[PDB]
Amino acid sequence: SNEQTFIAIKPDGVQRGLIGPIISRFENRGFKLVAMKLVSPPQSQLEQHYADLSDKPFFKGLVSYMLSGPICAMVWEGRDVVKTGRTILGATNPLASAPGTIRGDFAIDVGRNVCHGSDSVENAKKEIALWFKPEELISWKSATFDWVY
Amino acid sequence: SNEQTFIAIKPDGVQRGLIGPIISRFENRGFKLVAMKLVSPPQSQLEQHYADLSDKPFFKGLVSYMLSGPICAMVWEGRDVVKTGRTILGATNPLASAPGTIRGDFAIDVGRNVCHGSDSVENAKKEIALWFKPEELISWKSATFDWVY
Amino acid sequence: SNEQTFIAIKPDGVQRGLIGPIISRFENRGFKLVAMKLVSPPQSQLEQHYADLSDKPFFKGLVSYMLSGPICAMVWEGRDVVKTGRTILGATNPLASAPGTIRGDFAIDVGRNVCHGSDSVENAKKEIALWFKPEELISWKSATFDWVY
Amino acid sequence: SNEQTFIAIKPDGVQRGLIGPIISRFENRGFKLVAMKLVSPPQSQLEQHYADLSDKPFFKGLVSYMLSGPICAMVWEGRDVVKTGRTILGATNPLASAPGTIRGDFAIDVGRNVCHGSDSVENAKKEIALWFKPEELISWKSATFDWVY
Amino acid sequence: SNEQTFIAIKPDGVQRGLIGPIISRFENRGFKLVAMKLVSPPQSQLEQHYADLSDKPFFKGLVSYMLSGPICAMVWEGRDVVKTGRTILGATNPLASAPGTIRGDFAIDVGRNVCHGSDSVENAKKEIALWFKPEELISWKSATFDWVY
Amino acid sequence: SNEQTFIAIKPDGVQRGLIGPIISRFENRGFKLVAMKLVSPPQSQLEQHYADLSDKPFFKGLVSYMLSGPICAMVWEGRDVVKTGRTILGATNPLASAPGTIRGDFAIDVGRNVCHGSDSVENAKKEIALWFKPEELISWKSATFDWVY
DSSP states (O other): OOOOOEEEEEEEHTTTTTTHHHHHHHHHHHHEEEEEEEEOHHHHHHHHHHHGTTTTTTTTHHHHTTTTEEEEEEESSSTTHHHHHHHHHOOGGGOOOBBBBBHHHHOOOEEEESEESSHHHHHHHHHHHSSSSSSSSSSOOOOTTHHHH | OEEEEEEEHHHHHOOOOHHHHHHHHHHHOEEEEEEEEEEEHHHHHHHHHHHHGSTTTHHHHHHHHHHHHHHEEEEEESSHHHHHHHHHOSSSSSSGGOOOOOOHHHHHGGGGOOOOOSHHHHHHHHHHHSOOOGGGOOOOOOOTTHHOO | OOOOEEEEEEEHHTTTOHHHHHHHHHHTOOOOOEEEEEOOOHHHHHHTGGGGGGSSSHHHHHHHHHTTTTTTEEEEEEEEEEHHHHHEEEEEEEOOBBBBHHHHHOOOOGGGSSEEEEEEEHHHHHHHHHHOOOGGSSOOOOOHHHOOO | EEEEEEEEEEEEHHHHHHHOOOHHHHHHTTOOEEEEEEEEEHHHHHHHHHHGTTTTTTTHHHHHHHHSSSSEEEESSSHHHHHHHHHOOOSSSSGOBBTBBBBHOOOGGGOSSEEEEEEEEHHHHHHHHSSGGGGOOOOOOOOOOHHOO | OOOEEEEEOOOHHHHOOOOHHHHHHHHHHHHEEEEEEEEOOOOHHHHHHGGTTTTTTTTTHHHHHHHHHHHHEEEEEEETTHHHHHHHHHOSGGGGBBBBBBHHHHOEEEGSEEEEEOOOHHHHHHHHHSSSSSGGGGOOOOEEEEEHH | OOOEEEEEEEEHHTTTTHHHHHHHHHHHHOOOOEEEEEEEEOOHHHHHGGGOOOOOOOOHHHHHHHHHSOEEEEEEESSSSSHHHHHOOOOOSSGGGGBBBBHHHHHOOOOSSSSSEEEHHHHHHHHHHHHSGGGOOOOOTTTHHHHOO
């Protein structure tokens, strides 16, 4: 139940008024929010986040879009939260996503897919370290922890 | 993003108070409503709509049910809206549909499955031409088009 | 229970993705939808709709805004639907409206107040005649009429 | 449409404020509630309910958890309500469940999976007989029965 | 926080599929459900419930309507739950009720106002004693009690 | 439309899973989120926030409760957002609040009223300066600004 993942609401999700609904999906599931901030990060940070894609033809445009508005950055904690978080977000391409997921409810275009979620435990650790100062993670205990686990 | 599909809320969907929720599924996804009207169409129009099924034993009863109350007829526009619209509606037989879809949330009986969606691009074109006068399609641009695509 | 009112979702309501929610407020209350269409009406029709305001300094801009996108025009039927419809919409100025109403949930600016509702029975009759052809009103009986009245 | 299933909201579902939402899933689908009560049943009743699991190492702890708070016991009626009810609940292990189901929206841990549903028609009959006195099942006809079937 | 009130979803509320939403209003507010059952009570019980109205011309019809379908009977517990429960239900006449309340969201006719709530602490005690056997009230402690009070 | 207010979800709101819903109220209204972070601030900061109440008998307990879990701190921007934000939150004492507001939907006890909102423009400025570093306010333009104003 200590696993953590990085979930980010991308500029299109913020612009389209989806902060509340997206948070609610994770909150209602029983996962614990341990960090959150609204940020407009520097270009260098976005280039590091997508470092594995730096040689793709779409990299410059992806970085430009991720700079084009605010981002709601979050760390969520709970059992299997990386993989289950990806399941809640739905398929990366919304055309392949299931209604009932975030992208299956709210998105159409893979290049405007509303949100990001870490794709692995190790990548989650790297992304958490990239987007948050260590002191921004909040230690607390949910009143319903023993009813969720 | 110019593809269009015909979505109709059937008399059971209207009767059961599902107009708002059904519209919201397509609206929240990012698709654009370009035509809509509440109609009680003539029998001839319903027989033409289901022309491919005219030799089925259930055809007369299907037509009678489709005449038994108002229908909310709609044209929705967006990328892959025909196939993704069918995915949002869920399996034609609600027993085979997934929770999170319209039929998986709201319907039980294949003969009372709340809504219709075109099954192909070409059939969508035929259905749009059948149910709407050409001037009833509205040309407009969504303020969030560049955030959806 | 035969009283009718004209409710219109203005271009800002359509643009902001509020068709579904607004319909749901009236639908969930128990009122009966007897006419609906998505329309981009001619300027002359909008000038007639706001004829009582034709001498106001804001008239030209109001007409221009009402022409600036599609409108979801509706006729709703039920007991006291004119006055109760106005109550559901909330105060014309959203700053004076109560949370729980359409404007108190969704709007800020009196000039962008998302929706219109007839202000009297007689004005409702005039507005229904202006916006709808008489054949566009649908006669039907709700399956739950005797549970609402 | 006469098939019945036993659905129970477990103590964790009650504690986490999920009675309303869970009821709504079945209600919105078109199934008919024919029995319901909030109960804190005796240990003997819970041991009989899970009799098929009495030799499992987790049996004592399962019984203790099921005694640890109130349970919302329900009988729902409709076509294929046993299997479709299980589909609405989602996979028994929430990690394997789909967003859009009860467990895929609300639960994480198989030992805290919020709700129970009969796994077969015959087991439903046994569970209904166990949890309800025969007079607690209510005979009524939904006003929209002929619009659901 | 020990005050209790009797809330009943009337046959029209059950018929119109409002059990879930109504429960959610009280559940989300922080009140504690301590008793609930779906019941079709005898005529004598309904006549005793409305004993103070037995000389009204509408008494026979009121009793007949309250017998015409199932009722979801509930006891809710919390600070000021009688008066605040009445506030959540809204004005007895839905025409005088505020959107955001149960009747202001869901009802039109005072004779079909979806729900009942005790009008005073003493009447709540009488109604609880009338509708529930004393053993049907469940003693439990909410995991979030100290976060609500 | 440049006015700003400080809205904070208190530890009870976070604990009870209300971050998403509360954000949605402001988001759906049309206000712009310009700053947000999840924080567990130092005692000194909470004592400064409630400096005007430092001589009240309840001050120590209020500070202790505000330290007892995380807080979701936010800056929202829009016309009349201070006063309208207070209206959205509802009366400070939830017993005096209207259903449809945050406290009228979610809270009971004035000492556990889920959220804080600045009570004046000048106090909002002081609170924004207290809770946020100046660089944490994000400059951006909503895609629907001209449809809200």
